[PDB]
Structure 1
Amino acid sequence: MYVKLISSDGHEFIVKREHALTSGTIKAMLSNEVNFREIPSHVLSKVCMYFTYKVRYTNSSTEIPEFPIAPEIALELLMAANFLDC
């Protein structure tokens, strides 16, 4: 029902399995938990925000809002994004 996504700095993110399954990479690492030795907190908190954003707004006719990304965080998020295939 839920899985745990652990970051480089050991913050623990608990997210519905379905949401996490937005990442093909994570989909494969599963099928309990997953550790990400090279993804920091500040980045993985945004990824999980994306999974929930993705699952809410896909297949929607009622105007989607932008996904906001702070410039400070763009580069790392790009790398994580690329790795996780999402």
Structure 2
Amino acid sequence: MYVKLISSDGHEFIVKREHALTSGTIKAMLSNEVNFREIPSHVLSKVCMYFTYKVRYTNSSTEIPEFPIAPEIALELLMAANFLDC
């Protein structure tokens, strides 16, 4: 079961519904495509990788790697994270 997250520049990211629901804001926008007028693809792609990361490593015994964020996207990703509450 999947949902579609669409960036400001029209990139369509298709992710597991349960991964998207990680975000309280997306849960709200779904209550199954969501458009993000302010989030470009180079940020939303990273947001999607975070879902996968969080779901994979939450309450896991195996050692946890650092979630990587390039300096050039950090400010925009901060803003999206704040909006999406995660």
Using the alignment, how far apart are the partners of 1:28 and 1:58 within structure 2?
A: 23
Q: Distance in 2 between matches of 1:29 and 1:54?
A: 21
- What are structure 2's unaligned runs of at least 5 residues? none
Query: What is the distance in 2 between the residues matched to 1:14 and 1:46?
Result: 13
Query: What is the number of residues matched between the two proteins?
Result: 86
CA distance in 1, matches of 2:9, 2:70: 20
TM-score by length of 2: 0.98
Uncovered stretches (5+) of structure 1, i.e. residues with no partner: none
Calculate percent identity across the aligned residue pairs.
100
Q: Distance in 2 between matches of 1:53 and 1:28?
A: 22
| In structure 2, C-alpha distance between the alignment counterparts of 1:65 and 1:21, rounded to whole Å | 23
Shift of 1:4: 0.1
Distance 1:70 1:77 in 2: 10
Q: Matched residue of 1:15: which SS?
A: strand
